[PDB]
Structure 1
Amino acid sequence: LGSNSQVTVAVRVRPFSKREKTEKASQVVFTNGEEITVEHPDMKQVYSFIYDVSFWSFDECHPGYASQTTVYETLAAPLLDRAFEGYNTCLFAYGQTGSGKSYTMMGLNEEPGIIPRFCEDLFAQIAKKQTSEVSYHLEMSFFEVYNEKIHDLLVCKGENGQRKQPLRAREHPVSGPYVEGLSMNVVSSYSDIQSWLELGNKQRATAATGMNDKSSRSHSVFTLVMTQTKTEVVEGEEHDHRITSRINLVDLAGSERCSTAHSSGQRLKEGVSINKSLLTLGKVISALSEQANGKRVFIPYRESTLTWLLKESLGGNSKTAMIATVSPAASNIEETLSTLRYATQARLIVNIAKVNEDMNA
């Protein structure tokens, strides 16, 4: 039961952002096809990083320009086809503030990302195969992590200044962790998800910071549980054995220094928490890589809240994916190396994913 699965990792550069364009920034990152190289202004050394997929979005006519409908067909479409057999899947995004992860996963209204492509193509891939034989169920929830406190986003918050009930996490002995109080809503068509995402993202705690005009101050997790009830050789009752898959799509917050992102008051108090969570989302990658060499180790999952929920996603039973977004300016050289040196770590994680099927009993 189960198979070895190298964790999938992809890298992606963003075109020069407006503020750095006003500063007249020097390009530092280059792509020799697949391999990325980073040259300093110092040019004292030249680090090189190798990955499995290397996108490019600097300018729209370079040969090799991976658009929003290219980071699907190379990264997320395998995750979609791997969740038809039954394997659990994940796709989560690392980077710094302004590196472009909330533009890749969710896109913008005219440029949609992976969530809309995934969902609408899935429903396009369901009505192409759905018959009277095997059913197709889909539920979905959408939660966030704000200052070490889980919150739901599809809970229409009304008449108070703090309609923001803090939920909690718990550990099931077999099914692993789970959130208590999580609205798990049912969907049938893409027209049902667009009204949830439309409400969820309006609830996600965004703010205005020096790095970019709309900066997320939260990690967001987006679930889809798809169970297909199959029929096959039996004695009597059919529609019994069913294969279940859990697709989690995660959009994180960013490294954010206090100088580069002018902030005080409350902005600085959630900045710390993003940083502590992403300080622990590094230990979990580093120490899981150190398992590949036989070296016995402990993965500090419980040091934070996000890496406690996404615990079966990094290791565990999940075919996972790390999209790694990095800026091309020289002002963002002391933080792009940090992103890419963790992306190269993530590729070495071997996790065992197994098709999930339970016979009626």
Structure 2
Amino acid sequence: WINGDKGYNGLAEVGKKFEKDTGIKVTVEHPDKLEEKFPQVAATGDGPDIIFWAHDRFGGYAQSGLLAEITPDKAFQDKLYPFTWDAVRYNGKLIAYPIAVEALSLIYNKDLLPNPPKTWEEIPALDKELKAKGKSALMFNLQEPYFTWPLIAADGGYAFKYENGKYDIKDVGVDNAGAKAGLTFLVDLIKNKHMNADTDYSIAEAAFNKGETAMTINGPWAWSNIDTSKVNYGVTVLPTFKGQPSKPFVGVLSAGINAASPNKELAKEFLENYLLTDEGLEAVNKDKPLGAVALKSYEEELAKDPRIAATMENAQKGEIMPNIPQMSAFWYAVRTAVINAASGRQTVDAALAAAQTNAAAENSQVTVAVRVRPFSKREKTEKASQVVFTNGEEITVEHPDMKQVYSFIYDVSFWSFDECHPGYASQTTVYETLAAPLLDRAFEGYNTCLFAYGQTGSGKSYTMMGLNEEPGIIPRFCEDLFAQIAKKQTSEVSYHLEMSFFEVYNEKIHDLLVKQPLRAREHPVSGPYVEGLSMNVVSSYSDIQSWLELGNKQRATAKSSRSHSVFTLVMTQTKTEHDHRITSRINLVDLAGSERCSTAGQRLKEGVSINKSLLTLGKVISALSEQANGKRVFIPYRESTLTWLLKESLGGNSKTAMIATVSPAASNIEETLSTLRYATQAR
């Protein structure tokens, strides 16, 4: 499997010669969303033996365990440029053969510009000239980092520090000086009207191919269209910046072998000894040009064409495009950086500082727990029957009709149904398993949320607060916390806790530690905050308990809870003249009874607003989960007050968790299924 845009029958020719030498016939096909279908089909132990695609999507298949560990000897590795092998490396395993190589180059109008500039610094001057003569120095696509990054990386920007065939996921080069200088100089071109911020791909292409501008930046795909344009063009090295080369992301067309294929040995023989040779690549190139190639020997032939030469010069000076899931997060962080600094609505420093922290953001998954409580007094009186069960991980709902069985897996399932059961879940168990780690995250400097989700009676309060005979999460957490402060607090580090306790009622904010509506506002770095919310210093749990008593006295009636209570602990961790502060927000949120209890006043507005608010929470949480698995999505924080307020404590580097409580009873099976399905929403 190779692409349709490539040279298929040329590759078939190399297979048509493989049969001759071996006797084994060749499999060359170019089907469909081949890249999108390959993981669909390779996942079930099918697909082709060999797949040809760019290394972009190869990093994923590898993670999915889909490609085999290739095993060329050094002798063979030495035949291709050493940098190309970094493309086809995942989790420190060689997982494909580099084939072709692709990179942005400087493209210029020989007629307008016989001697193109070596140097970015030249362009303003160059431009001033061409504009006086009714033309322009340079137009390229300023909309997307793929194109802008090269200049940005020149003085030292980088996406993820790559060392031991490892990308330090945590080491990002978007904030740094090298990146500031590139973006700054870029932005200046714009400021000084040497380029337009609105310039995208088509404008740029149109302009260059019509003879309106002297220069553009594009990749070999763009050549053909110039050819048709009859514009007299040259393709060359990108300009230096601060005497350092521009660093475009390199795209390596690479050939991997299916982990499923039994032809692993035969495939290797084919790629190494047939395809990857002067003859073998010429066969393909002749059909449809490979651009620059990884095979040193043949590239040297190809680089006779100085356009190709230059794709190579620039690929080598560039950086292999990371095939990791975090690249997305990077792409979008930097896109937004550049858009806003080019706009002038935001300084370079602030743009890139914002982008660093989005590109470097953990995006940890949301932890979902479930707890099934014992039969309530009321349910026993109702002669209630069990409809909820455990099996191993799985919580299973078996409808009385016995046709309907719904099952669910959460990160953890707390089975507190029968105080007996060899896996019964006590209060301590619930704490140690779900919340303790949050406290460890809080101490590491991460913001955290614990949401408590369920219908009235399902055990939210029991779980969160508890009773003197049986203390729930909040009390244990605080006493864990304070005992750890005691431990940790030293002449090196100091701990300070403040506490706010508010509620979201009908999307309004009410402070429970004093009912007037407080206004939400937003800081552009530190995010949403409540204007006029009390922050009471705390020193022990007893302090908090006072406060949570005062607060809960003023929360919500029916006795159902009809607001979302937000218990918050801001903890400042001051070390020392030279003394930083590390801030963790800890939000413990008792959500409102999920009952969609809709029958026959302002009690209704509540219901409406609770359903709406909880739906939005779920949406964002769901978005979070998807985000955490690396896919670009929109997170509707702003769509609900609770979610907007906790924005900075939800995503980013934050640690979010939810405990859904349910009733084991047949009476409640529908709300139980609402809850459990909700909690799945959250993966």
Q: Residue 681 of structure 2: which of 345, 348, 357 is its match?
A: 345
Give, in whole Å, the separation in 2 of the partners of 1:295 and 1:80. 28
Shift in CA distance, 32/258, structure 1 to aligned 2, threshold 3 Å: closer
| 1:286-333 deviation digits (Å, cap 9, x = unpaired) | 344444676644333222211221223332231111111111112222
Does the Cα contact within 8 Å between 1:326 and 1:336 map onto a contact in 2? yes
**1:257 matched to which residue of 2?**
596
Shift in CA distance, 86/249, structure 1 to aligned 2, threshold 3 Å: same
Shift in CA distance, 289/85, structure 1 to aligned 2, threshold 3 Å: closer
Residue 181 (structure 1) shift: 0.5
Give, in whole Å, the separation in 1 of the partners of 2:599 and 2:495. 48
| 1:16-66 deviation digits (Å, cap 9, x = unpaired) | 222332222221111113211111111114222112211111121222121
Q: Residue 518 of structure 2: which of 143, 146, 167 is its match?
A: 167
Does the Cα contact within 8 Å between 1:90 and 1:320 map onto a contact in 2? yes
Does the Cα contact within 8 Å between 2:362 and 2:653 map onto a contact in 1? no
Structure with the higher strand share, 1 or 2: 1
Shift in CA distance, 260/51, structure 1 to aligned 2, threshold 3 Å: farther
Does the Cα contact within 8 Å between 1:327 and 1:336 map onto a contact in 2? yes
Does the Cα contact within 8 Å between 1:206 and 1:218 map onto a contact in 2? no
**1:35 matched to which residue of 2?**
394
Give, in whole Å, the separation in 2 of the partners of 1:293 and 1:328. 32
Task: Point out the more displaced range, 190-199 or 144-153.
Answer: 190-199
Shift in CA distance, 82/259, structure 1 to aligned 2, threshold 3 Å: closer
TM-score (norm 2): 0.45
State the secondary structure of the residue aligned to 2:437. Answer: helix
Give, in whole Å, the separation in 1 of the partners of 2:363 and 2:412. 20
Aligned: 1:242 with 2:581: yes
Residue 193 (structure 1) shift: 1.4
State the secondary structure of the residue aligned to 2:491. Answer: coil
Task: Point out the more displaced range, 291-300 or 84-93.
Answer: 291-300
Give, in whole Å, the separation in 1 of the partners of 2:504 and 2:579. 37
Give, in whole Å, the separation in 2 of the partners of 1:191 and 1:295. 44
Structure with the higher helix share, 1 or 2: 2
Give, in whole Å, the separation in 2 of the partners of 1:87 and 1:21. 43
Give, in whole Å, the separation in 2 of the partners of 1:79 and 1:167. 28
Does the Cα contact within 8 Å between 2:363 and 2:624 map onto a contact in 1? no
State the secondary structure of the residue aligned to 2:462. Answer: coil
Shift in CA distance, 329/317, structure 1 to aligned 2, threshold 3 Å: same
| 1:183-237 deviation digits (Å, cap 9, x = unpaired) | 011112223212111211111123325xxxxxx2211001111111223xxxxxx
| 1:104-146 deviation digits (Å, cap 9, x = unpaired) | 1122343322111111221111112322221111111000011
Give, in whole Å, the separation in 1 of the partners of 2:362 and 2:416. 34
Residue 169 (structure 1) shift: 0.8
Give, in whole Å, the separation in 2 of the partners of 1:87 and 1:292. 16
State the secondary structure of the residue aligned to 1:194. Answer: helix
Task: Point out the more displaced range, 251-260 or 166-175.
Answer: 251-260
Task: Point out the more displaced range, 286-295 or 166-175.
Answer: 286-295
Does the Cα contact within 8 Å between 1:8 and 1:321 map onto a contact in 2? yes
Any stretches of 5+ residues in structure 2 without a counterpart? 1-360
Does the Cα contact within 8 Å between 1:26 and 1:330 map onto a contact in 2? yes
Number of residue pairs aligned between Structure 1 and Structure 2: 323
Per chain length, whose mean CA-contact separation is higher, i.e. which structure has more relative contact order (CA < 8 Å, sep 6+)? Answer: 1
Give, in whole Å, the separation in 2 of the partners of 1:32 and 1:260. 36
Query: Rg bigger for which structure?
Result: 2
Shift in CA distance, 115/239, structure 1 to aligned 2, threshold 3 Å: farther
Aligned: 1:190 with 2:541: yes
**1:281 matched to which residue of 2?**
617
Give, in whole Å, the separation in 2 of the partners of 1:260 and 1:329. 22
Does the Cα contact within 8 Å between 1:103 and 1:113 map onto a contact in 2? yes
Does the Cα contact within 8 Å between 2:418 and 2:424 map onto a contact in 1? yes
Shift in CA distance, 121/77, structure 1 to aligned 2, threshold 3 Å: same
RMSD: 2.1
Residue 4 (structure 1) shift: 4.5
**2:558 matched to which residue of 1?**
207
Residue 180 (structure 1) shift: 0.8
TM-score (norm 1): 0.83
Give, in whole Å, the separation in 2 of the partners of 1:118 and 1:275. 29
| 1:222-270 deviation digits (Å, cap 9, x = unpaired) | 1111111223xxxxxx451222211111100022233689xxx343332
Shift in CA distance, 202/71, structure 1 to aligned 2, threshold 3 Å: same
Aligned: 1:316 with 2:655: no
Any stretches of 5+ residues in structure 1 without a counterpart? 156-163, 210-215, 232-237, 348-361
Residue 173 (structure 1) shift: 0.7
Give, in whole Å, the separation in 2 of the partners of 1:306 and 1:153. 15
Task: Point out the more displaced range, 183-192 or 68-77.
Answer: 183-192
